[PDB]
Amino acid sequence: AIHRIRITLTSRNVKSLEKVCADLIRGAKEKNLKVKGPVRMPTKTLRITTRKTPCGEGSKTWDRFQMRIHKRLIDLHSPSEIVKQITSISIEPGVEVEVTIADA
Amino acid sequence: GGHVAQIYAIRQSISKALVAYYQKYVDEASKKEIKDILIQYDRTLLVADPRRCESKKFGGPGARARYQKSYR
Amino acid sequence: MLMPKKNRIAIYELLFKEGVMVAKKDVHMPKHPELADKNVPNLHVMKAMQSLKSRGYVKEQFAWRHFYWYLTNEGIQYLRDYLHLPPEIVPATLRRSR
Amino acid sequence: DGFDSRGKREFDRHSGSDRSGLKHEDKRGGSGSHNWGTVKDELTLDEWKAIQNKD
Amino acid sequence: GHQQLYWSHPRKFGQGSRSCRVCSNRHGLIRKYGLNMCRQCFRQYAKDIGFIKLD
Amino acid sequence: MAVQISKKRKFVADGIFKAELNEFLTRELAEDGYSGVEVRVTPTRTEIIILATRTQNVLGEKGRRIRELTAVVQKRFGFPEGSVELYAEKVATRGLCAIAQAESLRYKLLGGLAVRRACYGVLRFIMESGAKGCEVVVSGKLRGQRAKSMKFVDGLMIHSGDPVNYYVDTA
Amino acid sequence: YTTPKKNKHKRKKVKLAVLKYYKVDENGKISRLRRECPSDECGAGVFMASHFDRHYCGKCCLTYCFN
RNA sequence: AAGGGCACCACCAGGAGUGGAGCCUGCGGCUUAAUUUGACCAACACGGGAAACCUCACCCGGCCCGGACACGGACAGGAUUGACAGAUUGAUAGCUCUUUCUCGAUUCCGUGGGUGGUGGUGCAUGGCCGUUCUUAGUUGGUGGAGCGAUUUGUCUGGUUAAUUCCGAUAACGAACGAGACUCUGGCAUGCUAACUAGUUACGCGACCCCCGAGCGGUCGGCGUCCCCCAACUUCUUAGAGGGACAAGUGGCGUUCAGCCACCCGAGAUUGAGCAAUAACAGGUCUGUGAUGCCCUUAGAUGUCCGGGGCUGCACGCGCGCUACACUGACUGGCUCAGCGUGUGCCUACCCUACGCCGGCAGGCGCGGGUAACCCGUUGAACCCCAUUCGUGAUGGGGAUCGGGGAUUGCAAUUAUUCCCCAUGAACGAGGAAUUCCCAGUAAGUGCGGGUCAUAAGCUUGCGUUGAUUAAGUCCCUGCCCUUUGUACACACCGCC
Ligand SMILES: [Mg+2]
Ligand SMILES: [Mg+2]
């Protein structure tokens, strides 16, 4: 054997993360492997407030830059061994994956 | 929240929970005869206050106030 | 300028093992990230390959804070006669598995 | 005398250079190369060491 | 020049131990999130890195 | 893990790497019609694809330059032998790349072409290649101390709002 | 500018002749009047410089002096 | 010059203030070896500029070439490279001197030629940014007027935040900007989910109870993904969607564009980002391996090291902090947040729970966290509840100054910072003047980030408590449009 894994999805844009979550959930259900829904970590917002001007002149204009990190956890539970049952990554640029053991 | 915000949250939580419990399990006609009392006293007892806050801007201390400027 | 002979041949033989060689622009770095076992710092790497570029044997490109020296055809033959190599040894960039 | 004590001009629109002025005046009406156009323009080592140190 | 004092002065910390990874400038250095990037340079490469002005 | 890095610093590190790689490929392939670069990173390997107008020039003599570039980015960025790859792709409709047109305009001016003739030539080519509008501005000094800014625009153009981000390509 | 001090004369090497600090006798007997610094990295090739009151190997073979 | 229009960087009606006092900081002046320098609404807590070293660009000294390459010399019988001891120097810089070794073609000398520069010029430039201006303005096609440049369209008027629209109307149909757009906030007991968020129910408990409550009460006590051994998403997280449109009613109005009020509704004007044609000889060469030209280039304006300075004070100005007190201060108790950071390529520097030692600043041993897993249920402040003080420059205020103890750093003196005990100065609501501002706003009030080895009176955000006055006008201050005059067109900083 009974093996369970936790696949962690991380992306900077919502649509790429949603697509990988969708077709991985669909693939797991097609293989009749019971799967938990993608739970979402709160978005990591990297904010940097610099000054627009490259010099000291201006009207103290400050620029705000945002970077959003979206995180999802999907749990795969199979009565048999699991790594051989699912052997596809189905990824696109802009999103990364990491697979861990459910106990680990 | 703070002290006052917890107070207002508590009182409208009591009112909203009781009016919804009355709606769910007994007649809403008798729900209305206490619901009309609550609204005719204070609308905030059943409806949350939408106003929360305003973002701070880079020209002054607060949301709208600007810093002192001098010409001389 | 002044380098030991073992230092010059170590840099040259790496420039022929692969035709390219990067070097962070920090003259005070105690050791080059590559060939650190040969005990020659990044400064001597800088001046040796800027002398190659001045003679025309290598082309110099600069990114943010790194050099991207590219060995040329003219520099290939000079390395052959400098290190006493036959006209059969070629860099990996010039020839791979061919 | 065109500057104050700090060194700022009291007349910015008074061109302090003889060759140029405030407005850009074209050279020869905008003809010739390297200039703005005109209406006419509009119309292996390791294995060698291996055999070297084997003996 | 001499090895004893050419780099003797310790710079394990302070403003002079850090320079921009793009242009070696030691001023206005943004070290947040391990950026270690000169300020005007980060403004130049803001979109390429991934930071986008949402508001 | 103490060896690993936090996700926020990891994405920032990838952004710095992509910016440095894009800038270096710009400074090297500017004469070779360089347009852009995209990377697809997986833990097994990374694929670096360079979009250029002339892939026949990006490739060296029998592919020498591509091997040269993939080796030199490997040495700089510390990649393993198998985790670094390098492909080149011809950019369709090269007149619709603002970077490609900017490079060709630089080449024409370096040749010595008049500003009006070069700018009108590239402006026409963008239009028949298919666009809702375009605009080129050339600023600096030519033959004199005073500088000038010449503007050449046609078609429709937008400046404000979110649409300008995915409608107007600026270079 | 206007340096009050004078230009400092950098050291000029003596440009000395051939070493010739050891000879032979009685149809050839090798005899060295210069010491040897016996460290392993110093080697037997190098010779310790003899001074008025001290011995100093050419490499960093320490310095042995007689007090 | 006249007429219209708009604006809390204009006023009205007011609020908090600044200007008065001390101190922090930035400018000017003075002094200095240097007190580096740019900048004069749109300079003056600005260059993210909180500088002990570095930073540093300034002053006083001292190393090195990191002056490529080409050519001519000298050279394995030596071109040359380092160095122990003494002196010499601040220096354990063989910098130099005495002293001889050692290094082995890598250099050295000369002639050309590189190179670098936080050196000058932003009045040579690019890019970026500020301002006009975030006001509402700007331009084609066809048609009409013109011989023509040009003009109409783009306007008498009503209306709008908006040439935003409606209306007259030689104009019709458009384009940019405005709007629309993206992010954010408010509602979804509607959907999807969640042991890295939980909530209810149940089982062990632990205590209060027994006047009896007993399906009693509290539990941030333990458990039911310890996977067979409960469900569910209301609360939390975040995706897809919906929701709001002047949509309904009444009134005003050409009864049009629209305006006001009201019911129902979470919401009947949430704040931002972007942002035209163009101009400002506006600021930046000290952000850049962005850059022309000029200067320097070996006794260096390159580069490194030691020390000092950037802080220096008869004085003037600006941004601010603390206060002048009882609507308070002190002491004790009660007690509620949300942004958001967190162990590093170079890079040596993380956030901290727990226990022990000290009165405090702190020190020591054990851990956890690369993070909805740990700090953390962020036990924040104001506020609230009690005691003392009692109109006294008083227990208000904590400047100036003495002594002592700690942390960071190679280095703390010109005090880095912090802590303890001492002194207790002006200041009793501030002249003329002047700034910001319309709802979760002003303001009180703390907490994160950036700067950081040490650090915030700054800045950037977040949260808590939370109002007075106003739904107007051109009176003052500015700007826009139209008309008008012009000998201006380099455009009034003009011409003459
Ligand atoms: Mg808009
Ligand atoms: Mg005291």
Coordinates of all heavy atoms in Angstrom, one line a residue, chain E residues 6 14 16 18 23-25 28-29 32-33 37 44 53:
Chain E
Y6 N 47.1 43.5 0.2 CA 46.3 43.9 -1.0 C 44.8 43.6 -0.8 O 44.0 44.3 -1.4 CB 46.8 43.1 -2.2 CG 46.0 43.3 -3.5 CD1 45.7 44.6 -3.9 CD2 45.5 42.3 -4.2 CE1 45.0 44.8 -5.1 CE2 44.8 42.5 -5.4 CZ 44.5 43.8 -5.8 OH 43.8 44.0 -6.9
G14 N 29.0 44.6 6.0 CA 29.0 46.0 5.7 C 28.5 46.2 4.2 O 28.2 45.3 3.5
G16 N 30.1 47.5 1.8 CA 31.1 47.2 0.8 C 31.3 45.8 0.5 O 32.1 45.5 -0.5
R18 N 28.8 43.8 -0.4 CA 27.8 43.5 -1.3 C 27.8 44.4 -2.5 O 27.8 45.6 -2.3 CB 26.4 43.5 -0.6 CG 26.2 42.5 0.6 CD 25.0 42.9 1.4 NE 25.4 43.5 2.7 CZ 25.0 44.6 3.2 NH1 24.2 45.4 2.5 NH2 25.4 45.1 4.4
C23 N 25.6 45.1 -12.3 CA 26.5 46.2 -12.7 C 27.5 46.6 -11.5 O 28.1 47.6 -11.6 CB 25.7 47.4 -13.1 SG 25.0 48.4 -11.7
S24 N 27.6 45.7 -10.5 CA 28.6 45.9 -9.4 C 28.4 47.2 -8.6 O 29.3 47.6 -7.9 CB 30.0 45.9 -10.0 OG 30.4 44.6 -10.4
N25 N 27.2 47.8 -8.7 CA 26.9 49.0 -7.9 C 26.7 48.6 -6.5 O 25.9 47.7 -6.2 CB 25.8 49.8 -8.5 CG 25.6 51.1 -7.9 OD1 26.5 51.7 -7.3 ND2 24.4 51.7 -8.0
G28 N 21.9 51.4 -3.1 CA 20.5 51.1 -3.3 C 20.2 49.6 -3.6 O 19.4 49.3 -4.3
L29 N 21.0 48.8 -2.9 CA 21.0 47.3 -3.2 C 19.8 46.7 -2.5 O 19.6 46.8 -1.3 CB 22.3 46.7 -2.7 CG 22.5 45.2 -3.2 CD1 23.0 45.2 -4.6 CD2 23.4 44.5 -2.3
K32 N 16.2 41.8 -0.7 CA 15.0 41.1 -0.3 C 14.8 39.9 -1.2 O 15.0 39.9 -2.4 CB 13.8 42.0 -0.4 CG 12.6 41.5 0.4 CD 11.6 42.6 0.6 CE 10.5 42.1 1.5 NZ 9.2 42.6 1.1
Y33 N 14.5 38.7 -0.6 CA 14.3 37.5 -1.3 C 15.5 37.0 -2.0 O 15.4 36.4 -3.1 CB 13.1 37.5 -2.3 CG 11.8 38.2 -1.7 CD1 11.3 39.3 -2.3 CD2 11.2 37.7 -0.5 CE1 10.2 39.9 -1.8 CE2 10.1 38.3 0.0 CZ 9.6 39.4 -0.6 OH 8.5 40.0 -0.1
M37 N 20.3 42.8 -5.8 CA 20.3 43.5 -7.1 C 20.2 45.0 -6.9 O 19.4 45.5 -6.2 CB 19.1 43.0 -8.0 CG 19.2 43.3 -9.4 SD 18.0 42.3 -10.4 CE 18.3 43.0 -12.0
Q44 N 14.9 47.7 -14.4 CA 15.1 47.3 -15.8 C 14.6 45.9 -16.0 O 14.0 45.6 -17.1 CB 16.6 47.5 -16.1 CG 16.9 47.2 -17.6 CD 18.3 47.5 -17.9 OE1 19.1 47.7 -17.0 NE2 18.7 47.3 -19.2
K53 N 3.6 44.8 -12.0 CA 2.8 45.8 -11.3 C 1.3 45.5 -11.4 O 0.7 45.7 -12.5 CB 3.0 47.2 -11.9 CG 4.5 47.5 -12.1 CD 4.7 49.0 -12.4 CE 4.0 49.4 -13.7 NZ 4.2 48.4 -14.8

